[PDB]
From a paper:
We report that [name]-[name]-2 infection elicits a population immune response that is mediated by a lineage of VH1-69 germline antibodies. By cryo-EM, we show that it targets a semi-cryptic epitope in the spike receptor-binding domain. Binding to this non-[name] competing epitope results in spike destruction, thereby inhibiting virus entry. On the basis of epitope location, neutralization mechanism and analysis of antibody binding to spike variants, we propose that recurrent substitutions at 452 and 490 are associated with immune evasion of the identified population antibody response.
Through HCDR2, R1-32-like and R1-32-related antibodies can bind all known spike conformations, particularly the RBD ‘down’ conformations, and in so doing expose RBD, or disrupt spike structures.
Residue numbers in the entry:
A (entry chain A): 340 to 532
B (entry chain E): 20 to 615
C (entry chain L): 2 to 214
D (entry chain H): 2 to 228
Write the structure that this text describes.
């Protein structure tokens, strides 16, 4: 239901899922032959099922086609520093694919939002839902669309008739946790013949 | 501070104009496809809201100062956003030029001049008057078609064109300029960089400097066609005066390719053609875009995205819906690129299939750039980089290696000169027309010539610059120069002199590193991946770098020169000097056919 | 739905009363903050504490909120005369794609003494009989508290049709009053001999009868 | 600031409801506005939240495409439209305000709420009410105090008030609430206590005011002669 649902969330308030008291198999997520890009840092993509971890943190949101290269540790920009920062010790595993026939429609689908302005930087793994008007000048505006005051939250431009580098890409990241706790969720031993 | 406050103001326009230009271009896409009564309401609603958003952001940007930021990428775009135009005047003068612009676009569209013998059988202008003037072999037919065309429409358009010049001079006077001619010269001006400044006093200096060497080439080909028109019309054309006004091929005298079939110097050798090779293959429009896409990837240019093949006009599905043909590009944004082509199995459709395709390749350069990094100070860069690949596809060497042209056709000393004179009717023939049309408008906007001397000064420069003669003298009540496509819709004309000098500087800079030390008319860019890297490096610049800094690393010159123009027609320059032994070169200003 | 709450909790006026909120590992245990609200029966709910770390303006400091892993807790000190409301859990759920509230707990011990009731039976008038209906009313007043079981009889069988009981409201002298209707028709109203409404209150059964003829 | 909403409103099972949300002052065109409902019997649900600046809708997956919420920037008001009503729509809606913040949680909180709109729907729609007088008998009065009043039947909708002598009687009045019926209707009562010496000199007249139906029935009360 995280992958296939009726609709998704935005980047300023994304879906947070915790996998506990479960068991899974990462072999069906590799032989799907339906994902566009697949990056998996910190661990090899084919030898992550044998090693066991404690918790799995999965976040799901939408992003454009030209910003899929920004989900990586060690760069600056507009989305990766104001919505979701990536730390240096990031052992996550990002999976992205194109589903332009469901999250977009004719006439202009503007249901998903994003944050453009921010006062300063933010700590990684932190959500920002502040809808306050970012003041640019030195005078207060008291919530008006006048001078030296602009709204940080802006709308998308998703259209299903676009090209390849600007389509709504369903991107998910699977991060692992390492603490003083036994193994909880982990791929077990494959049933051989 | 000012650095972080200006960043939030620029990107808000980058994320808002990308949606305003997307819906306005969407209203123009359905307007050209299925002509209804409701699609024109979407264009007027999105057209008025786009003009209202430009005049609202211009009044807000006037409060911000200018002389405190040292960055170059913000200063060049702040002058583009502070372009009020029609909003500098009051509410009475702002609507007055909108009505005369809609009146100018309606009368020039349905141009209907027809017979005095009967008021019923009448023909339209486009494509009505373009086909009869192209296929014509009589002298009395073209003389009547030129006199009647400026007979009925020349009376009504003059009192409206005399009013169109006062509103354009008053708009530039309130825009902190002298006249309307400085508004066109101010677009080519740069600011911020040192040692590469371009003022307006030097724009008239270099244009007059290059005209003193092209005119010797122009007066040599003017005597060549004068030596060819004497044998066809011995009682109408004399080799002493000038060429008539109705014998310029077309009506306006822009393209001189209509006289190519009647000025053949060697009729015993067959010319190259693609129509005879496309009937045995059933060459469709999908094969046109496929073989042209294979030519662009083999040189270093990237591919085209999948969004181009989804929404693109390929052919007209019968006669159920009406679709007008005009080749133009539409920058929708966010990786959306459309085209409008009504393909036919002809000879001229193959040249425009690769020309307009180069516009899309230039539109895909700034794909990762916002709305404020569009084309630079001149709009001639789109036509320059789009026609250099069409000339590389029209050579017999490219058609032979692709598997279409027959290898038995040799290149002797009789079929290679015909290819040089064919391209001179569209490129060299418009160079003297550009100096005459622009300098007449650059002096009428100031006001040193009265209203009773606009026509007399117009006919005086047409005998010394371009060298044409008139069969009937016209008084000041006629309006001749307001029948062009660019003057009727307030378009620019400096771009035509730049696209003619940049199309040959790019033809020599792409095969100079491809170990092609041969002639310039045999240059080709096939199988050269290193030449495509240095070319694509400056297509993604846009308005961040001036034009004088982009061509420094390409051709090695700060200003434009005609040295590639003098070297491309070097076999043509040796062919014009050995044939003119008995014909007089030049023209006379006191010659007239009505004085005999 | 995904958030459950106890139906009722007991406490004493002067000790510490704690409440517990349990959900899933995707709405409260994932990392989202919890918000507690107070639903007073008769006014709009307001904000009490957000994030379990800050204090809004206008709220006393006696409320304490904490998050112990996957469950949130609310602890109060001292029961005043305004805690007769309901406490809810609000937390952002990702499976529901929005905010979802909890069940709600009622905070009341016991405050209703007893008393002696007094009933009044009124037969329908003459103008009501031609309207093709019969409304047998049975008014009860001056009793405490407002928990009366109303039953009807016709001297031969109990009436289990058309019986209605209204909720009692507080009077001006700290008493309660209610009424019970019986929807009948005048065709059978004259055939039976008598009618009565029998009620009980802590065993006290008062019976009053009328006669149409 | 304060948010003021409309009062009680009733409709038909299958019609559309049109309520509003008014704002007193400012700080309405800068923060998100959501709608929180509450029904007696279950918990509190959340339909959706609307941003007034960009005009973007954000509903939940539990509610289908049957309710639309719009906003206005000229007068700073919000409207609610909901058609095809069902039998479980008898609840109250609230016009709430959201104030986001920063932190690891970052949950949507409701710091400012509205007044409330009681939107109930059922059968037995508005018709003409019928009031019946009530008179004491010789057996019902044993001392110097008699009980009498007026009974209101087949009235709709709420709220309906009952006045005694145009408000001239204050001591001894008691207004009984309504009750749901099997047909979806209500019934109330109003009795007074007067001494027996004033039954033959001063009269008691009940006046019912039903402002949604605009019916004012003025009936006479007389003691019975047979008992
Ligand atoms: C164009 O408009 C006409 C108007 O009747 C309509 O019938 C037709 O379907 C439209 N075509 C497209 C492709 O929308
Ligand atoms: C001015 O700022 C822009 C963007 O902030 C930057 O690209 C440019 O290099 C700056 N100018 C100078 C001279 O550093
Ligand atoms: C575009 O060209 C590149 C390079 O040859 C190739 O890898 C890619 O598959 C092509 N794409 C399409 C849609 O033809
Ligand atoms: C490049 O050379 C190869 C081999 O001769 C040829 O097949 C191909 O057509 C050439 N490319 C172009 C664009 O002509
Ligand atoms: Zn073009």
């Amino acid at each position: 239901e995280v992958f296939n649902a009726t609709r998704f969330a935005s980047v300023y308030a994304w879906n947070r899922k915790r996998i506990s008291n479960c068991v899974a198999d990462y072999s069906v997520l590799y032989n799907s032959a339906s994902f566009s890009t697949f990056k998996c840092y910190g661990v090899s993509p084919t030898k992550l099922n044998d090693l066991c971890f404690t918790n799995v943190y999965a976040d799901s949101f939408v992003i454009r086609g030209d910003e899929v290269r920004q989900i990586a540790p060690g760069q600056t920009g507009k989305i990766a520093d104001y919505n979701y920062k990536l730390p240096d010790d990031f052992t996550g595993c990002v999976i992205a694919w194109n589903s332009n026939n469901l999250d977009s429609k004719v006439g202009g689908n503007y249901n998903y939002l994003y944050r453009l302005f921010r006062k300063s930087n933010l700590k990684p793994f932190e959500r920002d839902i502040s809808t306050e008007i970012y003041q640019a000048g030195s005078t207060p505006c008291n919530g008006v669309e006048g001078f030296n005051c602009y709204f940080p939250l802006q709308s998308y431009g998703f259209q299903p008739t676009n090209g390849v580098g600007y389509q709504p890409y369903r991107v998910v990241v699977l991060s692992f946790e390492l603490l003083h706790a036994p193994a909880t969720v982990c791929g077990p031993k494959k049933s051989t013949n | 501070t000012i650095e972080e406050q200006a960043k939030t103001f620029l990107d808000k326009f980058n994320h808002e104009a990308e949606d305003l230009f997307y819906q306005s271009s969407l209203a123009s896409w359905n307007y050209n496809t299925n002509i209804t009564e409701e699609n024109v309401q979407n264009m007027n609603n999105a057209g008025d809201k786009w003009s209202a958003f430009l005049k609202e952001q211009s009044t807000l940007a006037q409060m911000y100062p200018l002389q405190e930021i040292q960055n170059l990428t913000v200063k060049l775009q702040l002058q583009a956003l502070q372009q009020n135009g029609s909003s500098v005047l009051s509410e009475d003068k702002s609507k007055r030029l909108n009505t005369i612009l809609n009146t100018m676009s309606t009368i020039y569209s349905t141009g209907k001049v027809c017979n005095p013998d009967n008021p019923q059988e009448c023909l339209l202008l486009e494509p009505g008057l373009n086909e009869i003037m192209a296929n014509s072999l009589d002298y009395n037919e073209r003389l009547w078609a030129w006199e009647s065309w400026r007979s009925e429409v020349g009376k009504q358009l003059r009192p409206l064109y005399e009013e169109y010049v006062v509103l354009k001079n008053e708009m530039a006077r309130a825009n902190h300029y002298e006249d309307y001619g400085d508004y066109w010269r101010g677009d080519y001006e740069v600011n911020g960089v040192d040692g590469y400044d371009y003022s307006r006093g030097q724009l008239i200096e270099d244009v007059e400097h290059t005209f003193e060497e092209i005119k010797p080439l122009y007066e040599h080909l003017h005597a060549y066609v004068r030596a060819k028109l004497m044998n066809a019309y011995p009682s109408y054309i004399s080799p002493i005066g000038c060429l008539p006004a109705h014998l310029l091929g077309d009506m306006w005298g822009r393209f001189w390719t209509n006289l190519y079939s009647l000025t053949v110097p060697f009729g015993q050798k067959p010319n190259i053609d693609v129509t005879d090779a496309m009937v045995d293959q059933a060459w469709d429009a999908q094969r046109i875009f496929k073989e042209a896409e294979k030519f662009f990837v083999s040189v270093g240019l990237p591919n085209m995205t999948q969004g181009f093949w989804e929404n693109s006009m390929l052919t007209d599905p019968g006669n159920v819906q009406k679709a007008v043909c005009h080749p133009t590009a539409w920058d929708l944004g966010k990786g959306d690129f459309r085209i409008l082509m009504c393909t036919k199995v002809t000879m001229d459709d193959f040249l425009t299939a690769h020309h307009e395709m180069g516009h899309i390749q230039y539109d895909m350069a700034y794909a990762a750039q916002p709305f404020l990094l569009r084309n630079g100070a001149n709009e001639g860069f789109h036509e320059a980089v789009g026609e250099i690949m069409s000339l590389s596809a029209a050579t017999p060497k490219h058609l032979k290696s692709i598997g279409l042209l027959s290898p038995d056709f040799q290149e002797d000393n009789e079929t290679e000169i015909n290819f040089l004179l064919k391209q001179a009717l569209t490129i060299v023939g418009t160079l003297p027309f550009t100096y005459m049309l622009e300098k007449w408008r650059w002096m009428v906007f100031k006001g040193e010539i009265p209203k009773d001397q606009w026509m007399k000064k117009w006919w005086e420069m047409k005998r010394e610059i371009v060298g044409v003669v008139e069969p009937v003298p016209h008084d000041e009540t006629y309006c001749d120069p307001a029948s062009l496509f660019h003057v009727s819709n307030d378009y620019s004309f400096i771009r035509y002199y730049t696209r003619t000098l940049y199309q040959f500087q790019f033809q020599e800079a792409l095969c100079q590193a491809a170990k092609h030390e041969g002639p310039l008319h045999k240059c080709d860019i096939s199988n050269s991946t290193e030449a495509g890297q240095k070319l694509f490096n400056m297509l993604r610049l846009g308005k961040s770098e001036p034009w004088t800094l982009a061509l420094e690393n390409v051709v090695g010159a700060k200003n434009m020169n005609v040295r590639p123009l003098l070297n491309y027609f070097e076999p043509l320059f040796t062919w014009l000097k050995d044939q003119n032994k008995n014909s007089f070169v030049g023209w006379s200003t006191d010659w007239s056919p009505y004085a005999d | 739905s995904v958030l459950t709450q106890p139906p009722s909790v007991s406490g004493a006026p002067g000790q510490r009363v704690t409440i517990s909120c349990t959900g899933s590992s995707s709405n409260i245990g994932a990392g989202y903050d919890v918000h507690w609200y107070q639903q007073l029966p008769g006014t709009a709910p307001k904000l009490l504490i957000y994030g379990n770390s800050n204090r809004p303006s206008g709220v006393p400091d006696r409320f304490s909120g904490s998050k112990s892993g996957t469950s949130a807790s609310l602890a109060i000190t001292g029961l005043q005369a305004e805690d007769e409301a309901d406490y809810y859990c609000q937390s952002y759920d990702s499976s529901l794609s929005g905010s979802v509230f909890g069940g709600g707990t009622k905070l009341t011990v016991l405050g209703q003494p007893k008393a002696a009731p007094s009933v009044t039976l009124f037969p329908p008038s003459s103008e009501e009989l031609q309207a093709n209906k019969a409304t047998l009313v049975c008014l009860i007043s001056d009793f405490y508290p407002g928990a009366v079981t109303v039953a009807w009889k016709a001297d031969s069988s109990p009436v289990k049709a058309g019986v209605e009981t209204t909720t009692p409201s507080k009077q001006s002298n700290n008493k309660y009053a209610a009424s019970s209707y019986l929807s009948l028709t005048p065709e059978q109203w004259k055939s039976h001999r008598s009618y009565s409404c029998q009620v009980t209150h802590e065993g006290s059964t008062v019976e009053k009868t009328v006669a149409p003829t | 600031v304060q948010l003021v909403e409309s009062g009680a409103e009733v409709k038909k099972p299958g019609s559309s409801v049109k309520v509003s949300c008014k704002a007193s002052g400012g700080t309405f065109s800068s923060y998100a506005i959501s709608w929180v409902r509450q029904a007696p019997g279950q918990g509190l649900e959340w339909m959706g939240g609307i941003i007034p600046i960009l005009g973007i809708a954000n509903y939940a997956q539990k509610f289908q495409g049957r309710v639309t919420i719009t906003a206005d920037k000229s007068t700073s008001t919000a409207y609610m439209e909901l058609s095809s009503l069902r039998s479980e729509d008898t609840a109250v809606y609230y016009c709430a305000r959201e104030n986001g913040y920063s932190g690891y949680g970052a949950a949507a909180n409701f710091d400012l709420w509205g007044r409330g709109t009681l939107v109930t729907v059922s059968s037995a729609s508005t018709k003409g009410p019928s009031v019946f007088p009530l008179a004491p008998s010789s057996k019902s009065t044993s001392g110097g105090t008699a009980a009498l009043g007026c009974l209101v039947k087949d009235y709709f909708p709420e709220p309906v008030t009952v006045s005694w002598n145009s408000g001239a009687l204050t001591s001894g009045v008691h207004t009984f609430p309504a009750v749901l019926q099997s047909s979806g209707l209500y019934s109330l009562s109003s009795v007074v206590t007067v001494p027996s010496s004033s039954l033959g000199t001063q009269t008691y007249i009940c006046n019912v005011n039903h402002k949604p139906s605009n019916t004012k029935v003025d009936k006479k009360v007389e003691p019975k002669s047979c008992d």
